[PDB]
Each structure stands twice: as C-alpha cells, then as structure tokens.
Write a protein that binds this ligand. Sequence first.
Ligand SMILES: C[C@@H]1C=C[C@@H]2CCCC[C@@H]2[C@H]1C(=O)c1c(O)c([C@]2(O)CC[C@H](O)[C@@H]3O[C@@H]32)c[nH]c1=O
Ligand SMILES: C[S@@+](CC[C@H](N)C(=O)[O-])C[C@H]1O[C@@H](n2cnc3c(N)ncnc32)[C@H](O)[C@@H]1O
Ligand SMILES: C[S@@+](CC[C@H](N)C(=O)[O-])C[C@H]1O[C@@H](n2cnc3c(N)ncnc32)[C@H](O)[C@@H]1O
Lengths: 393, 393
Amino acid sequence: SLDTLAAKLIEKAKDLRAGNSTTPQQHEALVGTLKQVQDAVYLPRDDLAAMQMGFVTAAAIRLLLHWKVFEKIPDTGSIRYEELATQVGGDVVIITRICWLLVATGFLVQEGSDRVAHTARTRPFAGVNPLRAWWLMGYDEYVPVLLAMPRYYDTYGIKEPTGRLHTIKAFTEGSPELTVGEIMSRHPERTANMLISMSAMASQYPHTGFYDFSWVAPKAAESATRPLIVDIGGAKGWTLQAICKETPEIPISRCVLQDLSGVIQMVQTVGDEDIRSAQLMAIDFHKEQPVQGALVYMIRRILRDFGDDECVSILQHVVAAMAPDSKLLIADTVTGNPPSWFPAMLDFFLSTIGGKERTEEEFRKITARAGLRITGIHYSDKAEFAMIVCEKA
Amino acid sequence: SLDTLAAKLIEKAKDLRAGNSTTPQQHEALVGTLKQVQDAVYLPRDDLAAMQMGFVTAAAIRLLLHWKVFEKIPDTGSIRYEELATQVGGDVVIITRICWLLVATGFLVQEGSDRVAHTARTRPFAGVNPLRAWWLMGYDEYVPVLLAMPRYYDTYGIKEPTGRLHTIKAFTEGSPELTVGEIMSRHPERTANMLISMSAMASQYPHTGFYDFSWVAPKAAESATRPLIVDIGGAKGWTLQAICKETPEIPISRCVLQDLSGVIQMVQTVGDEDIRSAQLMAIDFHKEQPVQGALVYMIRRILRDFGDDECVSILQHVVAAMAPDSKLLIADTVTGNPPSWFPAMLDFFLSTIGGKERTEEEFRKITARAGLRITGIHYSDKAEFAMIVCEKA
Ligand SMILES: C[C@@H]1C=C[C@@H]2CCCC[C@@H]2[C@H]1C(=O)c1c(O)c([C@]2(O)CC[C@H](O)[C@@H]3O[C@@H]32)c[nH]c1=O
Ligand SMILES: C[S@@+](CC[C@H](N)C(=O)[O-])C[C@H]1O[C@@H](n2cnc3c(N)ncnc32)[C@H](O)[C@@H]1O
Ligand SMILES: C[S@@+](CC[C@H](N)C(=O)[O-])C[C@H]1O[C@@H](n2cnc3c(N)ncnc32)[C@H](O)[C@@H]1O
C-alpha cells in the first residue's frame, strides 16, 4: 500500500543513516512494493506515458553512450556542460537538452545550472562492464527486431517461429537464409560485446542446490568404467565443477564436457585443473552424441534456444546413446501457465531466435517424441528453473 | 529525501482514506511522487529490467493491436485463447505466448488455464479513441526515429536540429525535403490517427478551461462576415468545437479551420456536421496566412514543432494578415528550466521534428522578434499550458 511503501522508505533511510547494508531481499521488497502501488494508483494514461518515457530515456542513454559522454562525466563531482561539449566536439545546446531528460528522470543530477554529475544509475555506463554490454546488446540487437515483428508475422503468417532459419532476428538483418550464429560470425564487434553479455546471464541461474546428484556416487563405485555425467554444451565446464565440488564422491575425471572446438580448446588452455582432468570433447549436438552408455546426460539452458523439432533431434541423438538405465537431465525453466514475468519476458525474446520457455506439458510432449518419460521435476527457487529428470520410455 | 517522500506518500494515503484525493492535481501530484520514489530507489539492474520489460510489453501490445486481438477480447468476461486464435486466423501457441507476457505484467488477466480478459489497462486498445491514437503515434511514428538518432547526428553533426527540413523524422522516413507535417498528411491512415491523437492527454493539453473567449461574442454582433477565430494548423477543429461549445455565442460558421491539404480533406470524412459547417481551408503556414483581418488567429501546439527562426517566420506571415484590432493567440505548453517530467519527455521527442518545449521567456523572445507585444498570459491551473495573448507592437 502507499503506507507500507512509506514504511520501507523510512526503514531504508534509517539503515543508511546507521551505515548498515540494504540486503538484496530488502531492495527487492522495496521495489516490488513500489510496483504494486504504481499498479494500483496509475491510470492507463499514466501507464502509457511511463512506457513512452522509457523509450526516450533509453534513446538518450544510447545517444550519450554513442557520444562517449558518460566516460567524460567524472566518477564524483561534476563537469560543466560547456566542457563536456568541447570534449565531445559538439553543440552544448543539444548535449545539454539530452542530459536534461536524464536529469528530469533522476539518471543524472545537475550541480548548479552549469554542471552535470553521475548517479549510481549512470556510473555503469561510464566504462566497459557486463551490465553495460548487456544493455547495449539488448538495445542494439533486440529492439529493432521487436519493431520488425508485425512485418515479420505479415510475411511468414501468425505462426510460432520455430526454425533455426528464417528467425525474426535473421529476417530483420536481411539474411533469413542464415542462422543467428552465422550472422553473428559476420559481425566481430557485435559478437565481442555479446560475449561479455553472455557471461552475465549464465552466472545468474543456480548450478546446484536444488537437485541431488549424489545417486551417481554408488554407480561410480560399482563400475570402474561407466562414464558418469556428460555435460552437453557445458561451456567452460562450470556446472561439472560445481557438481563434483558439491559431491566429491563423483570423480570429475569420469565426467565428460562437450562443446564447440573453440570452447574446448580454451578450456584445455586456461581452464582450472579439476575441469581439465575431465574428458573434454568437441561435438555438434545437432548431429551426434559420441559418449555411449553414460549414467547421466545433462542439457542445461540449451533446449530453450530451439524449436520442438530441433529439440527432439538433439534429444534423439542422446536417447540412441543412452543405456536402459541412463538418465537425461534437462536443466531449464518449466514455465507456469500462466508464466511469471521474468520467464515470460525471456520467452518473448526467445521467439526472435526460434526458441521458447516451455511449460511442463510442452516438455512432456517433446520428451515423449524422443522416446523419453519425465520421472521427476525438481524446482530451484529462481523463476521456475528446474531439473527435469528423464528416462527411456 | 527518502523521508520527505515517505511523508508525502503517508499524507496522500490519508487523503484517499477520507475521500479527499479527488482532483486531477492531486492525482498528478501522487503520480509524480511515485516517480520520485522510483528515481531515488532504482538501481542499474532495476532500470535494465524496466527498459527490457517496457520494450517487450510495447511490442506485445503492438502485435495484439495489429492482429485485432484486443478488439475480440470482450469488454468483460473472458474468451478462450483458442477462440481468439481462430478468429484472427493465427496459431494459438504464439498468440498465447504473447498474451502471457501481458498477463504477467497485469495488462491482461488469465481466467483458469485457457481464457483471457481485459483489464482497465487494455480496454483503451480495444477500439478507436484518443489515448490509443496517442500511443500509436508514439510507437509507430517516433520509436523508429529514436533508433535513428545516432546515425542522424553522425550525418548532420552534433548540432541542435532546428530546420523544418531534414528533421530526424524525415531522415528516417526517407523524405528529408518534406516537413514532418507534410509527411504525416500524405497517408490517410496516418493522418486519421494523427487527428484523433490531438484529442488525447487533455490532462497536459486542455482544449478549454484556462482562457475565456466570451469577449468574442460581442464583436460577432459588430459584423456579419468578419472571420472570428482562425485555427491555424487546427487539425480536425476539435479545439474550435470545444470553444464554441463553451461560448455558444461564437458561431462555428464564422470560424476558419486551416491545415495542410491532406489533413483538411480528411476532415470531410471524419468531421461531424458541426465542424464541417466551419470555413475549412487548406494552407501552408510556412508561406502564408491567406485570411486577412480576422478577429483572432489561434496558433495551438504549432510553435512547439519548429525552431526559433522558423517560429518567427510563421508568426510574421500571421502578423501581416492581422488588422489593427486583431489578436494572435498562442496556446501551448509552457514549462520551466529544467523542463518538468512530461515536457522533458516531449522536448526529447520534439527534437526529432526540429521542435522543443519552451519557457515563458523563450516564447517572449520569439514573439518580440516577430513584432508582437504580449498583453496577457493565462495559465491552466491543471497543466503547464497557457494562452499567450498577443497584438501587433
Ligand atoms: C511528437 C510527439 C511525439 C511523442 C509524443 C508522446 C507520444 C505520443 C505522440 C506525442 C507527439 C505529439 O505530442 C505531437 C505530434 O504528434 C506532432 C506530429 O506527430 C508531428 C507534426 C505533424 O504536423 C502532426 O502534429 C503531428 C507534433 N507535435 C507534438 O507535440
Ligand atoms: C546457452 S550456452 C551455455 C549452456 C551451458 N549448458 C550452461 O548452462 O551454461 C550453450 C552452449 O552450447 C554450445 N553449443 C552451441 N552449439 C553447439 C553444438 N552444435 N554442439 C555442441 N555445443 C554447442 C555453445 O558453445 C554454448 O557453450
Ligand atoms: C501538433 S498538431 C496540433 C493540432 C491542433 N492545433 C491541436 O493543438 O490539437 C500540428 C498541426 O499542424 C498542422 N500543420 C503542420 N504543418 C502545417 C503547415 N505547413 N500548414 C498548415 N498546417 C500544418 C498539422 O497537420 C497538425 O494538424
């Protein structure tokens, strides 16, 4: 309510004066309560005006990023608009107007009518880091594709976009005959920025803590030979390291990390010693699963990027390699009907590359097509992200 | 401070509880306080989530508009996703995914496992009205222009855009040699949406309530042929109709509605019998004011669209047409420096068409340059909007 929002501000204010730390939980609660109140108080005209303001604050930030203006505002203190203008080599009038939008929305602050300064909300824009890279990737790589969606669906029909080709992204780029990866390989600066972005999203879903892997331990004791955990598209092997740290009775030396040649090579070169002890293998999971009869095959945050038919192709290569008692673990969001806001947002972005966040029913359908049955779903505490346990039907 | 904000929330909650928070000024003030809270508490991760969710929610709304889904969701009650999908001839899965994004953000409501319903936030999209037209103007006609701003300033220099040609909007449209008004006026559906959008956001741009025209009624008796009010760039004459409703002694047949050829012709189609009984007239106010000697020349929300020199040029043509007892009335947004929240948003948008929001002193400098004397400024008590009353100096 308005009053509980006021209570949370009074609390924050006292804890700052007392120099104590706002927890992530208290911050979330404060922001959540603000949102509840705005949703109760704002009329439709307020909702839509706030949305349009969002467009222009993002454009203003983008334009100042383009002009390298955030780099020139000092970390603390302030800089005269005229000095900014001289250092950019542009007109002080337009630079000041752009800054004023950000002052009116609390991104920047003025110190006297002549000078501008950062807030905590703009310091990430003053240099290279993952939030800024992620911000630029979303704005430059996705916003034009979102604008292109009505034209896309006019062209292809009102149909779920499910292919690796003719994605909304590739359509927007002008090369629908290419995959998104092929398009990005033609764009080295955009890829570089994306690589930094890519690291941030991976870090924010849990690798362990919500599923018991220790049942692999007795098999490792019975069999000296059977491969234990195969991580398909495991990247730099962070998941395998986390599992074997959590349960040291699972020898990482009997696990298998599969990815692209370039990623495996970087693991072999600068990967830590535990992961380098695992069996590393370059594969194409669209065409093959080379490890036969492993106890566990894991597919983490991969199926969300593909349509059903492509997921069933990946899955069936694994099922052909599975022994009768193998498990196939899919780590991915099992979205609700209806979904919560963060997976619902991710799903909307995934539609531009042919993927989606599936419901439990949708996962049942694709695993059954691959000859699997889901025997358990173990949810983490983060936005319906779950371990889906599958065995041969 | 967090504490003064908390106290403002607490006091507005009291007013609501007693039934004493009725007025538009009170609503606007509470909305402003909530925005101040947002700005004081949001951190980069919150701003990023809000940017992403804003763009995604906008594109979802745009697709459901384009597909005529909002029109098919009943005003109350609910409809099955499968019925919606069949009525728009679309795939139920992609339609559901997109509705689900709006369900997750409280724009739509899902009933059970498979039905969807309007909220007050989406009913504006279910049919033709000014708020919907305003939203479509912003999204269709300005968001793609926002994305073009980096390239525009790389093309023309980091300089305040002040010309009526080669605006950012005409640059994006691919017709730099047309003014933005000419571009809007050449396509019927764009023109018709523009006309309806000029009736939106009366909370910022009231059409009456702040200036009393009743002094015109007398002079209507002085003569039978003299034009009483000339509405320069008057769109579809909504403001003339508002004035004549409130001063029924001013006959609308003695008023002149002037706009571009394409706009004034559309008034034959959409205007009611009342406005179509006015003197409709195509003009180009960059070049001429063809009606000499009128009692009042009204220039409402025109000067905002142009730079200072072009505004002087426009006013000079009107001054030449004026008789010694004529008045020239400028009706427009009048803000402070820096601009308040809503005019700060508009100032940024107006930069893409060569315009800006202005302070009272900025309007005074333009009117002086055009050889006018201001005899009165009459502010709205609900919006930063005023009638500037002028005569020949
Ligand atoms: C330009 C401005 C863009 C963003 C704001 C917020 C989002 C809703 C649209 C609204 C819009 C608006 O308020 C105005 C506006 O639409 C125009 C024009 O599009 C540009 C000139 C044409 O001759 C015709 O008059 C229409 C001129 N002047 C304005 O003030
Ligand atoms: C979404 S990313 C990270 C997935 C990883 N399981 C995780 O949770 O962090 C997908 C990974 O799959 C890899 N990959 C993409 N295509 C592949 C292919 N055809 N064969 C093998 N690996 C692939 C990428 O190199 C990337 O490391
Ligand atoms: C921002 S709208 C304001 C409309 C109306 N006076 C109001 O306030 O609701 C700008 C108006 O000026 C008209 N316009 C633009 N350029 C014009 C021109 N060169 N000559 C005549 N009208 C023009 C547009 O077609 C549009 O109706």
